[PDB]
Each structure stands twice: as C-alpha cells, then as structure tokens.
Amino acid sequence: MEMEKEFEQIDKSGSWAAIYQDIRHEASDFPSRVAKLPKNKNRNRYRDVSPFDHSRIKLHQEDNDYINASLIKMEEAQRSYILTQGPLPNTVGHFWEMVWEQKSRGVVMLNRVMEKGSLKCAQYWPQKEEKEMIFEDTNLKLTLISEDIKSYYTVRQLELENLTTQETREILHFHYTTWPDFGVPESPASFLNFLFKVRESGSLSPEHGPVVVHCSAGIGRSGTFCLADTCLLLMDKRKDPSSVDIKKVLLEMRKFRMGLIQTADQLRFSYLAVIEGAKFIM
Numbered sequence: 001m002e003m004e005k006e007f008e009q010i011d012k013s014g015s016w017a018a019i020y021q022d023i024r025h026e027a028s029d030f031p032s033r034v035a036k037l038p039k040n041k042n043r044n045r046y047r048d049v050s051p052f053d054h055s056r057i058k059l060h061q062e063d064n065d066y067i068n069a070s071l072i073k074m075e076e077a078q079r080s081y082i083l084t085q086g087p088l089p090n091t092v093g094h095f096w097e098m099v100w101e102q103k104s105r106g107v108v109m110l111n112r113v114m115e116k117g118s119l120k121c122a123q124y125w126p127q128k129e130e131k132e133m134i135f136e137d138t139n140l141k142l143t144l145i146s147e148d149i150k151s152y153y154t155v156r157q158l159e160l161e162n163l164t165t166q167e168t169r170e171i172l173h174f175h176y177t178t179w180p181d182f183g184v185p186e187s188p189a190s191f192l193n194f195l196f197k198v199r200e201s202g203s204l205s206p207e208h209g210p211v212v213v214h215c216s217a218g219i220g221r222s223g224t225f226c227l228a229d230t231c232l233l234l235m236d237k238r239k240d241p242s243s244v245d246i247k248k249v250l251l252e253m254r255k256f257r258m259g260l261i262q263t264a265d266q267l268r269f270s271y272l273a274v275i276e277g278a279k280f281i282m
C-alpha cells in the first residue's frame with residue numbers, strides 16, 4: 001500500500017497513537033545484561049535505555065569494554081549505523097575511543113547541549129582552534145580545524161590524533177541545531193536537506209566505518225534519521241517504490257536497539273520525511 005495513501009488514511013482517522021502502540025507491542029525484546037552490571041551504572045544516561053548484548057559496540061580494552069552504543073546493520077539497504085547516547089562527563093573519552101576503533105568518518109548530533117533549561121549531553125568537542133581537548137583515560141587529542149555555521153545546521157572539521165601512534169584522521173561533525181524543545185519540526189525540508197549533506201560528505205558510504213549518530217538517549221531523533229535514510233535508499237533500489245513498508249523497516253531496526261522512535265508524532269514526522277524525500281526530485 002503506497003505510504004502516502006496509508007498516511008492520509010491514518011491522518012483522517014487520527015489513529016497515529018494506535019499504529020505507534022502496535023509497533024511497541026510487536027518490537028523485539030533481547031537481553032541487556034552487560035548494561036545493567038553495577039560497574040556500568042555511571043556509563044548510562046537513562047536507566048530505561050540500554051543496548052542489547054548481541055548488537056552492543058565493544059571498546060578495545062581489557063579493563064571495561066562497555067559503552068551505551070549499538071550497531072544497526074541493514075542487510076538489504078547495505079547501510080550500517082552506530083546509535084549512541086549523548087556522552088556523559090565520564091564517557092567523553094570512551095566516545096572518541098569508539099569513533100577511532102570503528103573507523104567512523106562522521107558524527108551526527110541531533111540535539112543542543114542545553115534544552116528545556118537542562119544539560120542533554122557533555123561539551124565533548126573544542127569550541128576554539130587554539131584550545132584543543134585531551135582525553136587522558138583513552139590517550140586521544142581533538143582539535144577544531146574549521147566551522148561552517150548555517151541557519152539549520154553547523155558542519156565542523158575536527159582532527160582526532162591517537163597519541164599512542166601519532167596517527168591522525170579528519171572527523172566531520174554534522175550538528176542539526178534547530179530541532180524544537182517540544183514536538184517535531186512542522187516541515188521536514190530542513191531535516192531532509194541536512195540528511196542529504198551527511199550523504200554528500202561520504203560519511204554514510206562503505207569505504208568508511210559506520211556513522212556515529214546521537215541525540216540525548218540515542219533512540220528518538222536518532223531513530224528518525226536512520227529510518228528515513230534506509231527507507232529512501234530502499235526506494236531507489238526496489239523495482240516497486242510502493243513495496244517499502246516503513247513500519248516493517250522500523251521493526252527490523254528495533255531488533256538492534258530498543259525504543260527507536262519515542263512518540264506517535266516522531267512516527268508521523270518519519271512518514272512525512274520519507275514521502276517528501278520521494279517527492280522533491282526522487
């Protein structure tokens with residue numbers, strides 16, 4: 001069923017809440033035993049958001065290999081994403097260790113450091129060229145190289161140095177800065193624009209490690225980003241652009257991380273983004 005028609009049918013009936021609860025009911029449930037170990041309590045931002053053991057990213061150290069991050073592997077679309085929480089004051093070094101070990105080219109950030117008057121994640125990147133950051137626990141150095149500030153997003157060039165080997169890489173930071181404090185954007189135009197700039201960078205491409213995507217919990221806005229990317233990629237691949245079932249793609253992705261898409265408004269926004277993306281030029 002063409003999703004544009006499914007869309008108008010749900011909207012006219014106002015059943016978004018009922019569709020959303022059907023997804024929550026059918027979603028996978030796998031063990032998260034490592035996340036719940038007492039040694040890892042200060043490595044988790046939210047008590048109810050944990051990576052499944054089967055899909056969690058492991059840090060390459062013997063001490064404690066744990067980070068709140070999951071590998072989402074979409075087999076037919078041929079895309080991989082790492083979805084993670086906003087780093088905490090004691091996990092900023094772990095975050096950059098993961099970016100290094102997984103060979104990521106891009107970091108996608110969908111939240112502001114402060115929202116609704118509360119801190120949603122640590123200030124984990126340098127704000128001035130001449131004031132670099134050193135993460136002593138993981139032996140990494142991070143320098144701001146350049147900054148390009150636009151109306152809806154900012155792109156930063158960063159240099160990450162492995163102080164152990166003196167190798168360096170260029171990391172692109174894509175920061176979507178205008179998601180509202182409450183609800184979802186009214187139009188998906190600016191989100192889709194931002195999405196097609198991450199692609200153009202090469203950050204989502206198979207010659208690099210998976211892109212690192214985060215918001216505060218790493219399930220809501222982060223969910224919306226990878227669901228819309230994968231659905232548009234499948235529509236360019238499948239003979240029948242009408243065979244792409246967004247609810248089925250979301251349940252496949254929820255086999256790899258719990259809770260992806262946090263509200264019925266985020267589900268509706270995801271539909272709007274995909275359809276329009278299929279409109280525009282597609």
Ligand SMILES: N#C[C@@H]1COc2ccccc2C1=O
Nearest residue numbers: 192193196276277278280281
């Ligand atoms: N390349 C490219 C672009 C840029 O932004 C878009 C926004 C909505 C729908 C499609 C697109 C593209 O394909």
